[PDB]
Design a protein around this ligand. Sequence first.
Ligand SMILES: NC(=O)c1ccc[n+]([C@@H]2O[C@H](COP(=O)([O-])OP(=O)(O)OC[C@H]3O[C@@H](n4cnc5c(N)ncnc54)[C@H](OP(=O)(O)O)[C@@H]3O)[C@@H](O)[C@H]2O)c1
Ligand SMILES: NC(=O)c1ccc[n+]([C@@H]2O[C@H](COP(=O)([O-])OP(=O)(O)OC[C@H]3O[C@@H](n4cnc5c(N)ncnc54)[C@H](OP(=O)(O)O)[C@@H]3O)[C@@H](O)[C@H]2O)c1
Ligand SMILES: [Mg+2]
Ligand SMILES: [Mg+2]
Lengths: 655, 655
Amino acid sequence: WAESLIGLHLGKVALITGGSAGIGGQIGRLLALSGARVMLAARDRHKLEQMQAMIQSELAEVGYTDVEDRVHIAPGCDVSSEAQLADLVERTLSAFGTVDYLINNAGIAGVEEMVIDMPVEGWRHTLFANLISNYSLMRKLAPLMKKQGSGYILNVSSYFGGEKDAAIPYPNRADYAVSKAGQRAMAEVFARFLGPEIQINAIAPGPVEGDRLRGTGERPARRARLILENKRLNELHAALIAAARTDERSMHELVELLLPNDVAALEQNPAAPTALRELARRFRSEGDPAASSSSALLNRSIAAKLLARLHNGGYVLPADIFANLPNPPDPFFTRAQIDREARKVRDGIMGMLYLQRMPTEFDVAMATVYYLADRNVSGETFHPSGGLRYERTPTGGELFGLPSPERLAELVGSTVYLIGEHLTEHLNLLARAYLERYGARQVVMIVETETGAETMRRLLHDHVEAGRLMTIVAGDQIEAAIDQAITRYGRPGPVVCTPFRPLPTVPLVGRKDSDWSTVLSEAEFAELCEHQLTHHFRVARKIALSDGASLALVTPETTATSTTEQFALANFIKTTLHAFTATIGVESERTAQRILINQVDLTRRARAEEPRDPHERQQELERFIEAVLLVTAPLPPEADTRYAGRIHRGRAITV
Amino acid sequence: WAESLIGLHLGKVALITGGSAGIGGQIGRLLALSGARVMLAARDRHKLEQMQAMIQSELAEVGYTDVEDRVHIAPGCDVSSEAQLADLVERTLSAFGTVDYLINNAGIAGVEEMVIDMPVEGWRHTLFANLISNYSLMRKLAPLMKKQGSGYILNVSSYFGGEKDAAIPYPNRADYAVSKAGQRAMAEVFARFLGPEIQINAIAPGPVEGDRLRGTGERPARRARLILENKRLNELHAALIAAARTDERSMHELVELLLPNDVAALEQNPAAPTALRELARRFRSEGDPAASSSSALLNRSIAAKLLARLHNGGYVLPADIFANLPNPPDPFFTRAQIDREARKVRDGIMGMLYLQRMPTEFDVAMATVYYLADRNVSGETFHPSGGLRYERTPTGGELFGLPSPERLAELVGSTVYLIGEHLTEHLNLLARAYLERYGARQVVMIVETETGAETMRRLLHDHVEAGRLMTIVAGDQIEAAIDQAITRYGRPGPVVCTPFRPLPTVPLVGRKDSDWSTVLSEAEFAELCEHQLTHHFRVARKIALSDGASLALVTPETTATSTTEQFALANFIKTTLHAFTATIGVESERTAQRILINQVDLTRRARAEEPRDPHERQQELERFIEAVLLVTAPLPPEADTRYAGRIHRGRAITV
Ligand SMILES: NC(=O)c1ccc[n+]([C@@H]2O[C@H](COP(=O)([O-])OP(=O)(O)OC[C@H]3O[C@@H](n4cnc5c(N)ncnc54)[C@H](OP(=O)(O)O)[C@@H]3O)[C@@H](O)[C@H]2O)c1
Ligand SMILES: NC(=O)c1ccc[n+]([C@@H]2O[C@H](COP(=O)([O-])OP(=O)(O)OC[C@H]3O[C@@H](n4cnc5c(N)ncnc54)[C@H](OP(=O)(O)O)[C@@H]3O)[C@@H](O)[C@H]2O)c1
Ligand SMILES: [Mg+2]
Ligand SMILES: [Mg+2]
């Protein structure tokens, strides 16, 4: 079976992260059999030593000599650590000299929570491990590739990273999905800079058959119980948030209704809000009578996670409010309920597959090693396995109008939050539109610095003097700044989130004979992700937890005079953020959250599409206001049908 | 170099159309070297015999015996002929038994004209050769594949066939682009029906280095002269159409201004329409003084093509109007002008390439033969070469509003054409919207049959009685029906084109042990293309030539109860038509035609997205009216900037 392989990559040097197991281990194995010298990087020394021994033994069987010189390992390499990535490259160049193939394969599953349960530091960790590490190793190895005249960078992405002009929602996996999309977007935007010497592509396999204790989650008991526990969390949280919106009682007083932990008692309480009574009826109806979740509202773990949501949304509750909660007797969910959910998850994944069979890690690696021989592709995403039924979200519509007068009527008297700093003209125009045209009660302007605050206060002095425009300085503490806005000015209706910072103007590749010292650094790439991705994630997480009505995520602006590097970085951000917007849109829809989250893009693909004179610029800015109103005007009560609700969440439109 | 190849496809039988040269010849060569028995089909016997001899000689060199039994040919096979496709399959099964790989490679360049210069029969020929033939051979060979438990269908598409959620405009190549998109869409929608036994995928190479006398046009003197002649045609035609719109003189009287064939005389004529005087100034300014096109308006070949445009748009001119046209002396365009345009075309294509090198036919076929070994992909489009800078048009935006009141004001007093038959509720609602809400002067309802006409007249009896609704019966002569509307009721402003026919409800695949006798036939697939693609092309061609202001192309309707086969065929049509809409949008924009052409989709990807109750259905139909108004309301004079004009052409939105 190896005859087609031997010789295919003779003379090449390959570095494979995550190379001791999974797809990466098989890619390393087959590259070695094809004649490449390989360096396998991973954390655990023992697994690496086992994989190295297996590959070396196989090489000797087919006739290679001195096999210890053909397969090396780099243990203790956690790709989320920049220092360990630097050491990995030093070790690889010491062993083999210049690297020909960089196989960016390592990937972690990530936080595996909904955005509103996702710690900010966990999000950042996923980005460092799965995305920033890919840039870091490219930045270290591409100079030598260019100097020798050839090289290859392959980012191992996922079907769930989306495709060129469509996002694929991956609920409960937003950090992972964003990291996978960024891997593809990196190949898409760097290809023109890295050519002609260097190819850069992504692979995006679908679910792969593998070790059922590891993997990054695409392939198929405790997870089923966790699904049922987070369903109970979502239903309780949505009903409490909704009740608090239209009831005079505080959130504290509403949570006190749950403390007897008695489903029937809550349903039968004539003074309980209708949303909580109807929820209790559903628990009793939809529940297994042998499960204590049909008669008890909560257990202690759900209660703690619910309390965290409420605190993180700025609701005031004592930390010991659930300390005396009656503990429901086992089982909270029955074995039958758990096995039913488990079969549902498994059958759902298998039902995606047109070919009705799961590919193996060996199969996917074999297709990948053949693909690596192709010298005429760059900026592409190859699907070594595929044929999947799954929901997708097309991006990049440009033809749109204003929202309906019915939706615009919902803005009268509203509290609007605007977040930004450097897009001062856009912020001024938006504040004036909401206040002067659509009857908003007031606008809270949340900026990064005092200098940004004073600039906006001067631009909006008339509304500042009239008490209609308030300004808050957030720095790097956007969540605390939103809490100040909630306490002092009230919870937001519409929210618009623009980036604090502009895009950098440094080179993206170096000249063949340069040291690359001015090229975008590993730290600067991490800073780019912080200001243009993590910024929006933090705001979306906080605003959803705080019961905002709508949220527009706005990408950086490209213009007719943006540098070619700014266009590349802007389109990288636009594609990668689409994965976030699509995923959180579906998350919110499926868990009965009312918030509408969408994306408004100030970035275009090509300079020739941009406005060229003051008239066209006026047209563009009017389009921006129309786009933001189209996604932030709330749906009136007789409109938020199942059908309309899916339309108005998770979308991206291009100004 | 062949060691990786020998054995890879041992025991397989492959049929390759277009197999005597080009990419198809190399695919046949490398499949044979990999161990497959191959049948090569093409028209010319001599080229096939040469290719067969070359492959057989190479097989004997590497050790195969009885090579005459491994490479067969089928000469005289024109894939546009259904009878010849039937004979090809009979000949192949007689030689080899069951076919394992169907390589649908044959492709013709097509008409190579703008839509408004494209004969309807030439369009149809391209569809038969490049797209309908692919279904026909699948329909004949898939039953045997399924019966044996395995098979592979590969459609050789093009980069310019687009990708999953974006169209790629290919100006002057609409027939070709549509055929390439349909090849990909066929793989996308049939994969779930053909699995698990049968894989179906497309390849979409970019430009390939090949024989410069053939090819399908993607790769780079007479073509440069033709480009310059069609630029002169476009500029004259656009100025005449525009002048006739706002001048009291007939088209006949306006063309009489051109008959002295004197650029300076037309520029200096104080009684000539400003659009013609300004055009003449440009000819004198932008022209090479050594070229007679700088002092003469036309030559006889341009004049004949211009007269055809005008006649085909219903303008009345004597057939001999140019019979006495003064013939300009050679050269009409200088060698320098022609070489400059030639370098422009070549450098443009080469400038697309990130890797700055053209792939060879051998390279692309090698990557394709490796790809064919992958058993875990279906419904995918593999790019064996790629890395291209090129404009794309994302499809499938769902979040839109009404158009601006400024654009809606442009509808007051307008003449509207509506085309359709089976979507009677949509036609009634649209007619009533234009007449009752937006002040249109009258609506001409163009249907297919008398029964359709009477149904609409009854639904709209009040507007019929008031003379606001006129009805015309088109049958299979839509162009003659539009000419009747022009003569009797005036030229159209907005036009809406819906399909006459619904989608069929027959099976798309047969049971393993059936004769497939009820499965969608080759003739029924051709009929599908006629009613759901060629219908829109004929209307777009005629309405653009007749100076319509805007045109909405509307796809079939899917609902919550459409059959699974209807969803598949509807999405096939939606994807394939996007290629047409995007291409003609850019064609119109680049040649200064004012018409706005866009697509409104009544098809969705998934049943779960459809309305489920009367309220959601009401919401859907309101969205349809809003979508059609958003694309058909004309741009007021102070709005049709370069920037806004590109936004409002070539787009597709999903209701
Ligand atoms: N699995 C699928 O179905 C699937 C589908 C699509 C895409 N993908 C992509 O395929 C790639 C590999 O996935 P997989 O299923 O093979 O994953 P996996 O089974 O978890 O991969 C295990 C390998 O990764 C190493 N590794 C794990 N965490 C690491 C870290 N932080 N730093 C360095 N090495 C690390 C492991 O060794 P140590 O634990 O000792 O570090 C081992 O070498 C990922 O990029 C993933 O996103 C997978
Ligand atoms: N060329 C490119 O740059 C490029 C790029 C992307 C996609 N493609 C796709 O690649 C495929 C092959 O393109 P190519 O460049 O190889 O084309 P080509 O050079 O014109 O292909 C020549 C082969 O096609 C046969 N052929 C031509 N017309 C035929 C017909 N009507 N019926 C049957 N056989 C016919 C020729 O033999 P006879 O003349 O004797 O019939 C010969 O076998 C097409 O599907 C094309 O759309 C090409
Ligand atoms: Mg701009
Ligand atoms: Mg529908």
